[PDB]
Structure formats: C-alpha cells, structure tokens
Design a protein around this ligand. Structure first.
Ligand SMILES: CCCCCCCCCCCC[N+](C)(C)[O-]
Lengths: 183, 84, 220, 73, 183, 183, 183, 73
C-alpha cells in the first residue's frame, strides 16, 4: 500500500474518504493518535487517487469566520473591531436558523459589512444580504424562495426584496453501493 | 473616534518601549557590578570620576541618535491624522 | 561507428549528406539543433572531417559571394527544402541575362555547394510579391502607408498600436520574411504617443487641435 | 462658531502628544541615573524645541490648515 | 536512482508526483519524517523530469494571503491595517462559499482594495470584483455565469453588474491509467 | 572530473543541470549535506560548460519581492511602508491566480507603485498594470489576450483597457532525449 | 607553473578561466578551501596571461546595487532612504522579469532617481528608463524593440515612448573547442 | 515671519546646551560628595549668571545678531 496523506484531522479524513469512494477508489483509514489519521490505497488505484487529490485540492482548509481576525482575547480594541465581531456573529446565527426550516440540508449567508467605512459624516448605506442553500430531492424551489426572502427581510432595520439574493440547489445522487476491490 | 483611540494607545505604547531598554540595561550593569565585588572591588568604573561624568554625556548623545528618528516618525503621523 | 550513431536517439532530426570534397555535411533545422550537433564534432567524437550547415548560414554565405562577383543581380532567396536540388528565385523584370549566362551562374553556384547535385533557377514576379504583402496587411486590418521606389517597396506602420495589433503584425511579418526574404519589401513598425486623447479638434482639409481653451495648434 | 471651536481643541490635543512622550521619557532616564533631585524641565524644554524645528512644524501647520479649505494643484 | 528533490512537505510532493505522472514518468515518494519527503526517478527519465521541473517551476510556493502582511499579534495597529485584514478575510469566505455551488470544483476571488487610499476628504469609490472558477465536464457555462454574478452583486453595499468579471473553464481529461515502467 | 560549482541550493542546481543538458553536456549532481550540492563534468566538456555558465550568468539569484525591503519588525511604519507591503502582496496573489487559468504555465505581473509619494496634499494617480505569460503549444494567443485584460480590469478601482499591457509567448520544444557520453 | 591569482571566489575564478580560454590559454583552477581558489598557467603563457589580466582589469569586483548604500537593517531610517530602497527594488524585479521573455539571455535596467530631491513641496518629475539586452543569434531585433517598449511603458504612472531608450545586441560566437597545450 | 521664528529657535537651541552641561556637572559633584540633600538649582543659578556675565555673553550675542544684517564699520 502507498501512503497518500498523514497527520489529518478526523473531519479531513472523512471528507477525503467520501471523495475517493465517489470515484470507485477503495481507501483505508488508520489512526495513530497524536500523529493523526493516515489514508492508504492500492497501487492500481494510486495514480487515480493522486489525480483526484490534485483536482479537488484536498485536504480541505479550516473554515474562515471574520470574528477570528479580531479575537476577543486581545489587549486593545478599536470600535471597528467590536463592530466586526458583532456582524460576524449575526451571520452565523442566521446560518444556524435556516437549517431548521423544512427540507433545508445546509445553508450559507453573507452580509454587507458597511463598517469598512465608519459612516462618519455621512448617512449610512442600506444593508444587502446573500444566501445559498441545498434542498432534498422533489422540492418546489420556485415556491420556496418566497419564504426565505420574507424571513430575511425583517431581520434588519432596512432591507428591500431587491437587495436579497437567494440561490438554491438540489442534493446529488446518493452513493450507497460499495466500490469494487482491485483484482 | 478611532483615530483618537489609535493615537492614544500608540502614545502609551511608545512610552513603554522607549523607557524600557535604558532601565533594563542599567539594571543589568548595576547587578553585575554589584556581584563581581565577590571577586574584585572593580574600581575602574566608578573611581575615575571624570570618566563616569563623561559617560553620562556620551550615553545621552548616542541615545538621542536612535530615538529622535522614532519621535519624528510619530510626529509626522499625528500631524497627518490631525489635518487630513 | 557512423556519425548518425553519435547524434542521438531521434534519428530523423538530422540528415547526413556526403560531399564531393570528401567531407560529411550535417543538415540542421535551427540554432538549437545546430549547437547540439557542433558539440559532437568539437568534442572530437568523430575521426573524419565533418561540417554543420543550416539555411540562414548558407543564404548569408552565398549572398556575400554574389556581392563580389555579381554586384548588380536582383534576386530573392535560396530554398533548401530538398538539399540536393536548391531553388534560386530571381526577378523577372530587374534582371537581363541570356540562357548561357544563367547556366554559367548555375554551374558556379554548384561549385560553391559541394553537397548539391544541381541548382534550379526560377524567375518570380515582383508585382506578385508586393501584392501578397499588401493583401496580407489588409487581411490583418493593420493601418499602413505604402511607398514605392525604383527597386523596393516600404510599408510604414506607425501610431498608437494596441497589444493585439502588435502581436498579429509580428506574426505576419515573420511569416512573409521567411518566404521572400528582406531584399525587396521592407516593413517599418513604430510606436508613438497619442497627442489627441482627450482634446477637441477639427479634422478635414483645415484641421487643428485645441491644446486647451485659448490655445490653437496647427500641424501641417 | 461652536463647531469651529470644537474642531480647534481637537487639533490641539494631537499636537500635545509627542511632547508628553518626551517629558515622560526624560524623567525616567534621569531616575535611571539617580539624579533624582534635578528638575527635568531644564532639559526637556530644549529637546522639544529641537524636535519642532527638525519637524518644521510651522510649514506643515500653515500648509495643511489652508488645504482644509482651499484646493490647490 | 537519482535524487530530484529533498525536504519537501506533503502538499509539495503530491503536486510533483501528479505533474510527472501526467507526462508518463513513473516516480517514487519516500518519507524520512523530520527530513520530509524525497522524490526519485529512473535514469532514462531523469532528463525529462528535469526539463519538466524547470518548465513548471516546481516545487510550488506556499499560498499567499493579504492577512499575512498585518499580523493580528501586533499590540497596536493603525486603521489601515485593520481595514486590510477585514477585506482579506471577506475574500476567503467568499471563495469558500462559491466552492459549495453545484458543479464548481475550485474558485478564486479578488476585491478592489480602496484602502490604497484612506479616502480622506473624499468620497469612497465603488467596489469591483473578479472571480475564476472550474466546472465539471458538460456544464452550460454561458447559463451558469448569471448565477455567479447574481450571487456576488449583493455581498457589498454598492456593486454594478458592469463591475463584475467572471472567467470559467472546464476540467481537463482524467488521468486514470498508470505510466509504463522503463524497459 | 573537474569541479564547476559547490555549495549550491537545490533550486540553483536543478537550473544549472537543465541548462547544460540543453546544450548536450552530461553533468552530475552530488550532495554533501551541510555543504550543499556540487556539479561535475568531464574534461572534454569543461570548456563548453564554462562558456555557457558565463553566458547565462549562472547560478541564478534569489527572487526579489518588494516586501523584503520593509520588514514588519518596526517600532513605527510610515504610510509608505504599509502601502508598499500591501501592493507587493497583491502582485503575488494575482500571479498565483493567473497560473490557474486554462493552459497558462507561468506568468509575472507588475503594478505601478504610486506609493513612492504619499500623495501628500496631492490628488491620486491612476494605476497601470503589466503582465507576461507563457502558454502551451497550439494556443490562439490573439484570442486569449482578451480574457486576461478582462480579468485584470476589475481587480482594481480604476483601470482602463488602454492602461494594461500584456505579452504572451509559447513554450519551447521539449528536451526528452539524453545527451551523449564522451567517447 | 606560475601563480597568477590567489584567494579568489567561485565567480571570479570562473570569469578568469572563461576569459583566458577565449584567447587559447590553458589554465588550472585549484581549491584551497578556507583560502579560496587559485589560478595557474604554464610559463610560455605567463606573459600573455598577465597582459590580458591587465587589459580586462580582472578579477571582477562584485555587483553594485543602490540598496547597499542605505542598508535596510538599521535602527533608523529616513524618507530619503526608504524611497531609495523602494526604487532599487523595482529595478531588480524588472530585470528579473525581462530575462523571462523569449530569446533574451540577459538584460539590465536603469531608472531616473528623482529621490535626490525630496519631492516635498517641489512637484514630482516624470520618469525615464533605460534597458540593455542580449539576444540569441537569428532574432529580429528591430521587431523586438517594440515589445520591450510596450511592456515598460505601463510599469509606471507616467512614461512616454520618447523617454525610453533600448539597446540590443547579439551573442558572440561560441567557444566550444579546447585550447592547445604548449609543446 | 514664519521663517524668522524658525531661525530664532535654531539659534537659541545651541545656546541652551552649555547651561545644561553645567547643571549636570553640579549635580554629579553633589552626589560624589554625598552632600545629597541640597537642591542644585540654588548653587548653579549663581554660577550660570556669573559665568555668562564674566564672558560678556550679551555683547557677543548682540554683535552676532547684527552681523547678519549689516557691517558695523
Ligand atoms: C500619567 C501619564 C498620563 C499619560 C496620558 C497620555 C494621554 C492619554 C489619552 C488617552 C489615550 C487612550 N484613549 C484615547 C483610548 O483614551
């Protein structure tokens, strides 16, 4: 067996395994504890596994949130930093709320950070919002975008339906059968 | 606001750093010269009073050649913020 | 140990020709290959005499000889697609020779090229050459001016050309030069700054530019 | 009138900061040398003057104040 | 066997393998632990391997992000630095959201940093955005540019469809068969 | 055998080897660890190797990036240093993005540094960009310049197609066959 | 054998050897380690070697770059020094970029240093650039000057084609055959 | 006017230095004698006065100022 990757996290290993199984590559996960997880494949499949690893740029990054740039554990804060943390937490609370709607599997939300200017000496600009979501098969996407827009509109002091973008997509086919083992 | 907040923090910080090194170095000198009395009285720092007296002027002169540049940068910065 | 065995694995990259001077000639396609070959000889891997040649070198050498014995001959280029029978293009209008004279020329060239069995002299039309040049510039949609002289044509392409134009012009000129050479038709490419951007002006028979309000410029 | 006065005090605030820095540093160095009894004003004042001439504060102030109202190119 | 490279890390090694395999060069990866990975090839392939390493300028650089120029470790930092970190985080969060759309394999985003001026005494300029993305084979690119533009437009206070550039490309052919071993 | 060069880096040595092989000179790379790499050739080839080393001015330099002149270990940074680091990070992130386009092998980018004055009391100047890139064989260069210009234009607050210069070139012939050994 | 030079470095030694070989003088390079390299020749050639060492003023003293006068590593810096380092870094990065163009073997670039006036109060003055470059044999120099000018024009905020000087030259004949040993 | 002021400060700066020196000397002597609990100003102001008057500082100063603008002869 040839070594593809070492020292992965749990949530990196499971993503890699998923992506390889989708392409009919049988892989094995081994745990070394403090050294993390290791992924191995057979030689006949080595070439393909390499090419897919490059094509998807595995293993994945950690997930960025703007609050990480302005830690609460810091000796000083400008008002800009506080305002940034505030917005960065509102975003995550909306993302966590949409996932409780009927049929939604996962979602992501973005807010216009007008704070990149102070709004000093000038009237503030209106808010803009964007949302992505994924639905179960057999859902009326057209009839579901109305609900999302309605819900988002009242979460802020001044938002127009024109300023809300919503993109929906369906789940891909399920990978239920196991890959074949090399002869 | 955030400009006033910045320039005030930057002031307190510059005081902390520019007053740091001289008092640390003086502590190290005063310690080692106090300790090595444990071997020899080490007159040649403090016995030649004219040389100790010159030392202060030398120190002040050299030090100003490292700090004035810093203060000039800070001054330009604050004037820029005040007027622009 | 033949010479072909020493040039590499890729055999058909080179062509070995014996010469009446009792010397091997190695025909190359470009500079990089030329130096790849010259290294073998300069290292001394081969014991008999050999020489490396290419089309640009031979065109230059023959033109230098023509400069001395035929200082008024009008001609284009010598093609070596078939190295045993080169083709020499002469002007139909600007030359005046008898058949005997042409044959003599042929024989003297054959003496300059000990690897060739014969040289074919072909007469080409200047109007054709010039026309193909102008048609190519129109095809590329370049701006140009044409000037005619007794023995040559010059195309001036100058202005505030764009990147796309520079690239297409360069490619075209490089293609033409390889066919006809640079003796009859010349191309002059020049970049110049735009005086006219952002200024109001009159164009026509009586043009002028307003450098600013209150300031008139009259180029002529 | 009121807004102008306010904006003036604001400027004065920024102008004070570097000299405050000087005034502190010089005292701390004199204490490090033990000359605790000497008044530091006698040394801090000339430093302040040196700093202001090397900074050329008059030219900067006179220019920037006009730039706030005029537009010059 | 001849040594091409030493002391690589995992993500450099897997890229070098992928590139050499694509050109029919069989290569071997060896792990020395604290000394990293080593890459080796056969003599008949040495010349080619050298030429390709030159042509692609391998091994690849580490990836650059603007937040690396302005470390949040600093005890006090000017409003310019903060504004830069903010923008340099939004860029990354956008890239990570686009990678969840249907069919996208990878993406990149760029934002106009007006912070090249403070915008002192002057109105702030409008935002401009550029995005690159790679799709699965058989995707109607023309019809998919619209979605991206729609999604990006609302992530900022003031953006016009005219100011958004989008460039799309398809995945190359898959490298599934293994290279041949020198005779 | 004669010693040409000693104490090379890995990325210098591979470049020398590439250049000598191109001219039919068989060379050898030796590793001394803390002493680096050594390059050797046979006597019949020594003269040529010397001539080429001079003509290409080998070994190559380290690559230069503006951020090296303004290291972030500072008590005070003027506006000028911060703005310089910023632009020197953008330049690199743009090159790294262009290498992901279809068919590009390598590229370089340049930005007009206005930062050589603060604009102190002066109106700001517009930005200019230059780019160089190398393509795979059989690429319609004329048709591909458009894509690059479009992509760069929106990466900045104010850029005109007139102010963007782009130069493209094709890769040279591949060096696959090995050089011959002196008799 | 007579000693010509001692204590050379690697680049000076290879330069001397190159110049002597060009004139048919067989020379030897010897390594003494911490003492550097030594160059020796036969007696019949001693006279000639002396005359050429004088005529070329060998060994070459090392390359000068303006940043060496105002070394960045210091306790202190001043606007003039910062501005100088900046320009002296742009110069080097441009030369390194030109050497990547097709056919160029080496190049050198010069910029008008306006920093010898502060450009404070006094209005800043427009830029001038000069470049030298050497090409491979069989290159249409006339057609290649245009590309260089086009590329350089957009690297700065304000440059006119009239203010850019470019001088090109071809590589000399190759020195491939070894010199003869004295009888 | 803005240039005259700056010139004045430039001049006065160089005149402060010697008096500073004298203050440091006095303080260092009091410490070296251990006659610690006496304020040095009481001692050094008489010294500064007597020294400057005994050298006619005011006369040299007046000449040095006028010779920028006239020849006295
Ligand atoms: C006893 C030393 C006092 C030093 C005072 C320096 C001025 C500090 C002004 C406040 C600065 C902090 N700020 C703006 C957040 O308030």
């Amino acid at each position: 067996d040839k070594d593809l990757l070492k020292g992965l996290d749990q949530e990196q290993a499971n993503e890699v395994i998923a992506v390889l199984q989708m392409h009919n590559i049988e892989a094995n996960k081994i745990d070394s504890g403090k050294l993390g997880y290791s992924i191995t494949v057979a030689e006949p499949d080595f070439t393909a596994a390499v090419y897919w690893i490059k094509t998807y740029q595995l293993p994945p990054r950690p997930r960025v949130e703007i609050a990480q740039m302005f830690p609460a554990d810091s000796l000083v804060s400008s008002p800009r930093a506080e305002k940034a943390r505030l917005y960065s937490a509102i975003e995550q609370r909306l993302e966590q709320s949409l996932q409780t709607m009927e049929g939604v599997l996962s979602a992501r939300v973005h807010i216009s950070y007008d704070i990149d200017a102070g709004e000093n000496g000038r009237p503030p600009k209106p808010v803009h919002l964007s949302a992505l979501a994924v639905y179960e098969r057999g859902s009326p996407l057209a009839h579901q975008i109305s609900d999302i827009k309605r819900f988002l509109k009242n979460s802020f002091a001044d938002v127009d339906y024109d300023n809300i973008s919503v993109v929906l997509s369906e789940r891909s086919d399920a990978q239920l059968q196991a890959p074949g083992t090399p002869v | 606001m955030d400009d006033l907040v910045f320039a005030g923090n930057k002031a307190l910080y510059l005081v902390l750093i520019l007053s740091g090194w001289p008092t640390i170095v003086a502590t190290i000198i005063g310690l080692l010269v106090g300790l090595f009395q444990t071997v020899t009285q080490l007159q040649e720092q403090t016995l030649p009073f004219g040389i100790k007296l010159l030392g202060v002027c030398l120190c002040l002169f050299l030090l100003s050649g490292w700090y004035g540049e810093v203060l000039l940068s800070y001054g330009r910065q604050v004037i820029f913020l005040a007027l622009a | 140990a033949e010479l072909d065995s020493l040039l590499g694995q890729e055999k058909e990259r080179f062509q070995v020709l014996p010469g009446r001077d009792k010397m091997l000639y190695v025909a190359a396609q470009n500079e990089r290959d030329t130096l790849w070959a010259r290294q073998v000889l300069a290292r001394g891997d081969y014991d008999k005499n050999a020489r490396v040649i290419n089309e640009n070198e031979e065109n230059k050498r023959i033109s230098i000889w023509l400069d001395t014995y035929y200082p008024q001959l009008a001609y284009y280029r010598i093609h070596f697609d078939e190295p045993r029978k080169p083709v020499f293009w002469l002007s139909r209008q600007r030359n005046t020779m008898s058949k005997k004279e042409l044959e003599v020329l042929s024989q003297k060239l054959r003496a300059l090229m000990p690897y060739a069995d014969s040289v074919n002299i072909t007469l080409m039309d200047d109007v054709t050459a010039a026309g193909q040049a102008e048609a190519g510039l129109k095809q590329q949609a370049l701006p140009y001016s044409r000037r005619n002289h007794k023995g040559g044509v010059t195309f001036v392409i100058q202005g505030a050309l764009d990147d796309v134009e520079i690239l297409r012009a360069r490619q075209f000129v490089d293609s033409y030069y390889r066919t006809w050479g640079g003796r009859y038709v010349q191309f002059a490419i020049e970049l110049k700054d735009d005086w006219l951007k952002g200024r109001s002006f009159q164009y026509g028979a009586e043009g002028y530019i307003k450098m600013s309000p209150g300031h008139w410029y009259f180029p002529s | 009138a009121l807004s102008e006065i306010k904006s003036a005090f604001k400027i004065g605030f920024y102008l004070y900061l570097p000299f405050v820095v000087v005034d502190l540093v010089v005292s701390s160095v004199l204490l490090a040398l033990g000359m605790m009894m000497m008044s530091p004003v006698t040394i801090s004042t000339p430093i302040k003057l040196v700093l202001f001439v090397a900074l050329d504060g008059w030219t900067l102030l006179s220019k920037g104040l006009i730039l706030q109202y005029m537009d010059i190119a």
